[PDB]
Symmetry: C3
Subunit: 465 residues, 3 copies
């Protein structure tokens, strides 16, 4: 017999002590570890006391399957009040992430063919590969200047300028000149603006506008000033492509955003909104799991040689046809699944369930907030034997086990672009370099809206030839 909602284990804490500790610490850096500990202590399902609303936390793929069933025509997410507040203030339309209901479905169906569809990936994958090549060849040049034919560095800046370049070329069809050169003032300010926006989000996110208004008004300024820079960067991108297309409609493929603009299925204000989400949403999301793959490969050399052997065999066919990298690199794809399992940028999946459902034999009423904690999900030994072990082979021996890009209609729009940028950088890196590190210690993870590593390790890149 199905147990009532109230029968479920309750989180020991409270929404006020959480609020005050956030005001204090100016963040919630250990949210992932807090929830992971709660799951260890209470079970794979528990309810958070919001003093009225219903909030459930899950960590099982069987529970994600049940959630997808309830999804409905319009899967609902929680309204991200601080973000929506900026758009309302400056008079901008919302992108597909911040949209809900029919307006969301209208935007999404017009976006999927150009951003996510396999036909679209066939078109922008050769562009991504071009930037991926330029990354390794720039590195190789620097590596060969040193006597020991290797360069030791913090790869993070390079990886970020790669994700900026690769995304810009995929969206707008413009080479920014970031890969292989000194970072732009515009790029650094953009990267900093995102970092601040994400930090301030957490600060304003866990309390109503009515409270945060007077408790933290300085944070609201910080947040909006940060968005002002993100939008300044984004609008510059759109103003360029909109003028270029206005005078000449090209024959060939010149990016995702060009497609959207040419089709004119969405309004300019809708294209502007979604273009913003894609320009800013492609930077930190792709670059952090890439840094974590490079680290884990430098940590697990045995895995690195297996992936290198694969990348060297398939090297020739990928050189002739880049779009073959998706199919001819099954282990490298599996390594990325493993990086996202242990290090999810998207700590939790979120749905304000549209109808009643039953999770772990507990009644979950309609309107209930359901959060799928990916950190805990990926770290349960029952479903991932030896979960601490970085093993891509586990994804080849074996269904909702791999949900880092979400699920259903609402699943990550930039999923296939991110995978493409990640696969191709790594394929080109494995082909020429050996990634090595003395930092064998686990990198601590920090919650700043995105689950980012706290520290960047020193990585050696030894030239194979």
């Amino acid at each position: 017999t199905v147990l009532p909602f109230e029968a479920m284990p309750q989180h020991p804490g409270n929404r006020w002590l959480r609020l005050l500790q956030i005001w204090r610490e100016q963040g919630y850096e250990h949210l992932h570890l807090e929830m992971h500990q709660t799951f260890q202590e209470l079970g794979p399902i528990f309810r958070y006391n919001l003093g009225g609303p219903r909030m459930v936390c899950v960590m099982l793929p069987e529970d994600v399957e049940k959630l997808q069933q309830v999804d409905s025509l319009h899967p609902c997410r929680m309204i991200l009040e601080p973000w929506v507040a900026y758009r309302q203030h400056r008079g901008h339309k919302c992108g597909v992430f911040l949209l809900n209901g029919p307006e969301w479905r209208f935007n999404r169906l017009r976006l999927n063919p150009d951003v996510l569809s396999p036909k679209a990936v066939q078109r922008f994958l050769p562009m991504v590969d071009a930037v991926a090549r330029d990354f390794s060849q720039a590195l190789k040049k620097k590596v060969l200047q040193n006597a020991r034919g290797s360069l030791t560095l913090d790869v993070q800046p390079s990886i970020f300028h790669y994700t900026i370049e690769a995304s810009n070329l995929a969206l707008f069809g413009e080479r920014l000149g970031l890969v292989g050169h000194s970072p732009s003032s515009a790029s650094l300010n953009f990267l900093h603006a995102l970092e601040v926006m994400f930090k301030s989000t957490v600060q304003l996110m866990f309390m109503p506008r009515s409270l945060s208004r007077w408790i933290s008004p300085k944070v609201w300024k910080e947040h909006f000033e940060a968005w002002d820079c993100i939008f300044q960067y984004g609008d510059n991108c759109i103003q360029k492509i909109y003028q270029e297309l206005a005078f000449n409609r090209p024959q060939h493929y010149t990016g995702i955003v060009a497609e959207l603009l040419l089709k004119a299925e969405l309004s300019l204000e809708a294209i502007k909104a979604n273009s913003m989400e894609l320009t800013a949403g492609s930077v930190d999301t792709t670059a952090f799991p890439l840094l974590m793959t490079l680290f884990e490969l430098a940590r697990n050399p045995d895995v690195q040689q297996i992936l290198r052997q694969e990348s060297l065999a398939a090297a020739a066919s990928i050189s002739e046809h880049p779009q073959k990298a998706t199919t001819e690199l099954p282990l490298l794809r599996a390594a990325l699944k493993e990086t996202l399992r242990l290090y999810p940028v998207g700590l939790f999946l979120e749905r304000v369930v549209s109808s009643d459902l039953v999770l772990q034999n507990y009644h979950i009423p309609a309107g209930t907030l359901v959060q799928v904690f990916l950190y805990s999900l990926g770290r349960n030994a029952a479903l991932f034997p030896r979960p601490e072990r970085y093993n891509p082979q586990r994804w080849l021996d074996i269904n909702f086990h791999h949900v880092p890009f979400g699920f259903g209609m609402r699943q990550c729009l930039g999923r296939r672009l991110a995978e493409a940028e990640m696969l191709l950088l790594l394929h080109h890196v494995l082909k020429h370099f050996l990634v090595e590190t003395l930092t064998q210690e686990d990198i601590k993870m920090v919650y700043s809206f995105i689950l980012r590593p706290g520290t960047s390790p020193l990585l050696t890149f030894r030239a194979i030839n």
Copy 2:
């Protein structure tokens, strides 16, 4: 004939010197000056007198009045003493350049400068150098353009155009490649450009009131002005110290710039060469730079005109490639397009002359010693002088040869005191545009008129987003 009316019979400007300075104190500038004077001409006629509470000041806007002004232009045409600029030079112990000199000292400097800066023989010598930089500008742009999928680059051209005018001028004056065209701007270049911007801003603030007033009303502006000049002179002295040392050890056979010829001739003192060299180094940046941009804008706005100029530049492309000095003669339309850009958008704004002997302008008696200002903005926008004045049409300057319109094109002034860098500016402007027209299509969605700002120079308020589409690719 009809009775010549006295000076006092002339319409008087409604405002006053005191309120004007109070406004400039408040606003920290006179950005609307051109529009203020243009409105005054609409309301009072083509001649009016400004009350300076003692001195005689007349304002004109007709070419017929410019003709009468040159008649009075003596052996030594003299202008108003630019007190703030002069003040810096006497404080730091520098000689004055032509622009700041008057009388015999001016004529002595001017006659020794004209053969190497302005003469056609000098233009034949520095033109191939300018063309070399003009080529490098387009080829650097083409490289950037071809990296993008749509084979076009959309940008604010202003920074590029400024680094072109700095590079082109430096190569023409000192025979040195600064490496600005096609590369990241220098800290020196950016600080120099900023220093000029500040100097021009502070000029407007101090030049509308006596030293007796500005010393207490705005002493902070005097500091701001001199600190700005300190940077301009630091840049300028570096240029001259280099060429002076280079020539001291080896006198070259070939042409290596304007300033090299002045130094080799030694007709002027080192302090006179230093003074004039400064005026030419700083005076060649913002001047050539703003009309060149307004041309790019107007062409992006007038595609019909652009294709006519491109067709011309493509036909003459081969002969200009063989001999760059042919660009002056073989590009008559592109030359007239520049006349049209300066007609609408004069970087000058006005021409001063503190008249040497009595004259009559618009049937009014203009006594000796009267300051006369020719407002070029108003002159160029006059519908009776230029039919459909808002229309950008280079063809209006072509079959006017022996039609009396000799005084309609006066953006570089007139007479002996006419702009010294006239022919260098025209060369930098023609050649950049010829090389740009040959490879790119200039396009813009910004069809709305750019507002002009008065900050000593008449500069655009905003810089538009311009697309440069590769014609070939």
Copy 3:
């Protein structure tokens, strides 16, 4: 008959007025000229009143000779209290410069074979030559873009980025990409940190910690903040090479520091300490005599053509084998001896005498601090006929302790042969392609900021020869 210590003429000034003038001026820029004037007024030997300790000042090679014989198995220098204070505070070991006694000798003997030995010079010389070439070819490129086929500039920044690049490649075997490109934020901050550290040394150097701690505490902060930047730069260099070697021990030569790490004769903390002294101690030291040689050559065109003729004849053999530059450039080597004679970056040699000695017929007791002022020594009209005249040929006649800019004995400069290599090769490659010229014929004023550096940098023209 030998004269007592007290019989020696005494410096007119005092410990306290010195201290206060350094407090007021925030430096002792004129020290060299002060001591040089004192020698002119008092003789070639005088004593400084420290109000207890014995301090003697000398300027004759005969006195250096006598100092060498008193040099024990462990020659002593004065403990540089501010520097030692940083290492003690942050828990770092001391390098061979800051060490004394047996600990010094232990470090020294394990350093000499890889840093100073001729066998080591044969290994790092081709690396230095590679950077020296890149310097001239980068210059040539810029020179040829100008109409008069010459570039006029302040060479100082370029020369500094050369010493940084050349030293880094020699020590760690890493190309920093400084030569021929825009200076790094890291390099500029490093150069600035050194400048500050040296300035703040002079300020804290002439008074005890007991006093400097309250009379100038702000200076102690700026000194340590400066060292923090120097150590941040240095530690990155080490952390890179230590990780690189941990995964693969190379077959070929990949720098000085690599050979020390591979030998493991010294502890990692000892290698770190000495590696820091070599990384920071090779920037300013090589740069200033290099910049001064360029200056003296532009004002001595006659000398320049002699050195150029030599460098052009030997050009081919040096191209085939760079290590031949040491032997096949005797005049260029002699020009460097002349640059250091008039422009000693050292300024004064120092020894805390281990046993009694007699200098200039005066009794010098054990424990007495003896300072050899190289500026005055090199400007002595009686041993250097027409001392103000720049003449490399005076080092070739030979009739001997006249050339002591790298010190003397076991304690003689560890980076002597690396500095000479960087200096010779830059100049050889510059002489081969350019003519150095200047209108600045007037002597550059020298400044004392721990190192003897030129106060002003002159404008130097580099005319392409063909």
